Symmetry: C5
Subunit: 214 residues, 5 copies
């Protein structure tokens, strides 16, 4: 029937993934000779808890992560005109992007699956709840409290993974309307760290949150 | 007994033919869409926390959907109309609560039921913590919080959603719960984010609840 | 001498296990054409906590389940007079029994291993901590508080898994004598339910507990 | 040259582990025909917490399991004089030894790796935290509180696994000097249980602890 | 293009890794005849909490670990002038270093990947959160409170793993300034114990922290 056509479609996809994944061992990840740029952005959904005793604060957000590999690339025409597909994040390489301030291991609130597009670009969007070092003090005043946490590669250097932001403006469109706390400013600024011990740049994306109780 | 051996063999052969012989289903495509039906059975509201503005639910979430590739003729399979299977042996939809502040906990064995026409019924029971403002939970009107459920990585063109009723199922609601239910609904909506020209469905659970005075 | 003889038992069990399990395809589970019965019963060790705020109660108990598979059947003479063995519960089908009204994922206190006997009967004894839905009002009256939780197949009906008890009363023989909570009465009894929607039976074992604070 | 000798010793160890484990099948565990004796002893590090609300107490201890199997036995002469080796607990059979009266799944504080000796004897020293049933009353009394816990096989009778202790003396030499509770006495004693229902013996080691606040 | 050398540099790395990890079976560990020296160092980040009912304090640090394996060496000129690479820590052997006085299974805050360099050296930098045994009494004094915890191999003696520090000074450059507690002193110092049971030495690196509130 028109049944036959949906099968054809599955097969082009079952075929496309196999060619991508099962016909090379694995992407070793980026190197100084193959570099990689990861674009970060944040949508801040909530500030759930501010804790004066430990000076820890707990956020819920979605971290948009975007990077392009030549190793995932295909002619849609060879594959039934498939321009993209969804797949398990465990089937691909994902950058090691970590907060440098976490006081507790991140918890993942969303299915780990990513979108891969024929030009070789991957867009992964993990929702996470994160506890990090923050001093809430002033959160009950009208000026509020100010906290910052940095994100970047844990193990690579600017020569292998670089970070980039589409905007310095964190996305509040989805922020919880009734959250215990309200948001004055949120911004995401890319920076470069240097260390005396080394000749390389270490990039990070700085999240600054300015909030107070409703 | 004699025939018991056969029924056994008939089932194993069926699952071999569905799963060993045929590869992993790649999931829905723009050219091979799904529709997942949602319904909720609310069982308890366990805790309301106004420090963090978080509420905890226990419910059963029913998911039903259909794949041709799970389809078979009972007469080659010894009149097997349906069978129960581990959920890991099949593709399941990546359906997530959009406002969860803690990773969902699963309270039930994860197994599903597949019927000869290719339909799957999956009914996971969960504890969810989502963003809710309890204010007014001690008062006659109660409080109103809502949470949405949708695919995380797929748009309406690939995974679509419907409900059987807009009425959430309260027949199992624990009668001594600290909170009593004033109303519970599950409603299907579509949103556009115009970064993209295609629909995003979600099922919206709205619950109004009140401390049980008694 | 007898070291060498003990070495033969070891190879016989190794071989029984190999013949049963990975020389046989994974058992599909019960059918309506191949049904089974699970016998359930509880040994209640502790009432750990009763939360008046969230209305949930934490129990510790060992849950005895038994069932009999024909596929696990064997003749002890072909296998060296081996009548039974301990095995990893991951190595065999186990039933889907679950508490119907828990508020948290159940926690296993015990290694998970099962005993397999040559008639194909299996005994499994998970020790658990369970938070179920409970209103601990009156815990401080001589009348005490009463809560109940049901266990049963989550995905199978009475036509694939029948469910039952050996005795109708929870084993209190191991109950912690210094827990904050005394037990007035503890019950486990089978019930069968039907639904309007569907014509087939759903069995469950209903566990009912009455408890006081310890004076 | 000095290296080759370092290199050659690795080859010898690798060779032995291969002969021992992947060459031979996984040991099924004890039988009534192949009984096994497990030696238990405790080193009590800390009493972390006592909850007089729920009546549970929290210990941090190191448990020393030791046992022996001919299957692990080797002649060091064929192994370049290798007497012993360290390995992960996954690579070998371990007794299923559990606290009978725990209220919480045990948390393992140490890397799980054991020591096998050429006479076929394993020594396993897992560091754990345990929450078990204890009623604290008196802990602020000179007399102190006494609680007690049993350890033994969850699934095996005295006919498959027998228990012993090297000594009856619990080792307090590593106990935390500044712990909230000072230890009064601690004893580890072998017991054997019988049931009317069944003919066979169940041993256990009963750990008894008398403690009070500092 | 220059997508080639990118392609070839990528090809060279996969070849190197397979030549290390798939030529020869995973390495057996150090042995008295193939001993190993691990260098430890600590970057202390935050003291997150001090619980004085249980006497437990919580640290967030990054432990630096280095060791050299002959079996990890290669010749850059055979491998494309590659001088080092980043890899998952699961692919390679790692030492059993742990905290001797922890009260909870330690938590891992960072992606676990290590840096392997051509001379066979590995740098691993786990970020951890540790709850250990600490009597915080005095934390409100001018003097503040002093606590200590030891680190070292769990199963390995000094004959197989030795410990070393580059400096006896913990690295406070990353310490969180708005942290609830101030750091008066921090030292990491090699010690060597003889345990009476066993003939050989067991070194540890003793972490000493003097901190107070404010
Ligand atoms: Ca870094
Ligand atoms: Ca979305
Ligand atoms: Ca049901
Ligand atoms: Ca027992
Ligand atoms: Ca030690």
């Amino acid at each position: 029937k028109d049944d036959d056509d949906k099968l054809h479609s599955q097969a082009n996809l079952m075929r496309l993934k196999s060619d991508l994944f099962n016909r090379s061992p694995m992407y070793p990840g980026p190197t100084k000779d193959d570099p990689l740029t990861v674009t970060l952005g944040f949508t801040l959904q909530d500030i759930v808890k501010a804790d004066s005793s430990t000076n820890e604060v707990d956020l819920v957000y979605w971290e948009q992560q975007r990077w392009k590999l030549n190793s995932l690339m295909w002619d849609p025409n060879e594959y039934g005109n498939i321009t993209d597909f969804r797949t398990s994040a465990a089937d691909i390489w994902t950058p090691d992007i970590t907060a440098y301030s976490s006081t507790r291991p991140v918890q993942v609130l969303s299915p780990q699956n990513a979108l891969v597009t024929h030009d070789g670009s991957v867009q992964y969007l993990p929702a996470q709840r994160l506890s990090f070092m923050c001093d809430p003090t002033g959160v009950d005043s009208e000026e509020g409290a100010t906290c910052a946490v940095k994100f970047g590669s844990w193990s690579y250097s600017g020569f292998e993974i670089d970070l980039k932001t589409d905007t310095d403006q964190v996305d509040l469109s989805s922020y919880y309307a009734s959250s215990k706390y309200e948001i004055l400013s949120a911004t995401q600024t890319r920076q470069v760290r240097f260390y005396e011990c080394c000749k390389e740049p270490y990039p990070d994306v700085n999240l600054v949150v300015k909030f107070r109780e409703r």
